[PDB]
Design brief:
By secondary structure, the chain is of the alpha/beta class. The chain has a single domain, classed as 3-Layer(aba) Sandwich (Aminopeptidase). It has 8 helices and 13 strands. The strands form 4 sheets. A 6-stranded mixed sheet has the order 10-5-1-2-3-11, with helices on both faces. The protein has a 3-stranded mixed sheet with strand order 4-13-12. A two-stranded antiparallel sheet has the order 6-9. The two termini are about 30 Å apart. It comes from [Eubacterium] siraeum DSM 15702.
Length: about 260
């Protein structure tokens, strides 16, 4: 015998995005179109908080008691990875973008440079191709190719198994804050035109058109930052990284899903 009491929308009112504008996208990176992605990161837009939450995962991360994220992505694609991540986080992840070295570098080159503080000098000796990668210490302006090489180093000279995730979360947060805050729908239309036409994605034009109003709203706010990140933690088990069950609860709090 519950009461039927409905209040219609103000209609003429100034636009303020509600929870219907919230979305998640699984983003992955491969060396090229033949190889399995090595990097995995979700991006969750929380319209109420005008923020984008990033969650990176190690390729050898075990999130179901079975195979690694990478193994699952090889066998069943990003859709399966996004499904397993949806069940564990309370998120509704259906869309994904699989970048390659080429398409991710082109995205960065198109959007703009990022200024990052390198905590200590890196001189990485790559034993696959016999090359040395030199990243100097300090606050510096990173171009597309410099940005890509920094983000994808196989070793940062740190014991921390989560450090490549922490670096990727931070560097991508900086990239979004420095180049997307204050952007127009016209500019964002160039970015999405590139995503839809040259990346491996299931994002359609209708998906972007239903969300761009909230995206432009959030980025047009007087904020120094529109990003946040949570790092899913766990433990080493052979060559696997078993995600701790207590991390999913901290992840739920960071997204406001549980």
């Amino acid at each position: 015998k519950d009461a039927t009491v409905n209040v219609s929308q103000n209609q003429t009112a100034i636009f303020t995005p509600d929870s219907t504008y919230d979305f998640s996208v699984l983003m992955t990176l491969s060396a090229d179109n033949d190889k399995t992605p090595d990097k995995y990161m979700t991006i969750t837009y929380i319209a109420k908080n005008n923020t984008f939450v990033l969650m990176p995962y190690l390729p050898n991360a075990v999130i179901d008691g079975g195979n690694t994220i990478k193994q699952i992505c090889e066998q069943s694609g990003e859709a399966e990875v996004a499904k397993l991540l949806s069940s564990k986080t309370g998120l509704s992840i259906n869309k994904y973008i699989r970048f390659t070295k080429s398409t991710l570098t082109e995205l960065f080159d198109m959007v703009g440079n990022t200024t990052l503080t390198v905590p200590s000098e890196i001189k990485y000796e790559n034993k696959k191709d016999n090359t040395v990668t030199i990243i100097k210490k300090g606050t510096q302006i990173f171009t597309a190719e410099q940005m890509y090489a920094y983000l994808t180093l196989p070793d940062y000279g740190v014991k921390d198994e989560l450090y490549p995730c922490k670096l990727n979360a931070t560097v991508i947060s900086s990239f979004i804050d420095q180049n997307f805050i204050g952007t127009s729908s016209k500019t964002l239309d160039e970015y999405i035109n590139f995503i839809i036409n040259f990346t491996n994605t299931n994002i359609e034009q209708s998906d972007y058109d239903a969300k761009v109003k909230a995206i432009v709203y959030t980025l047009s706010q007087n904020k120094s930052s529109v990003t946040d990140f949570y790092i899913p933690y766990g433990d080493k088990s052979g060559d696997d990284y078993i995600i701790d069950d207590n991390s999913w609860n901290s992840a739920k709090k960071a997204l406001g899903t549980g």
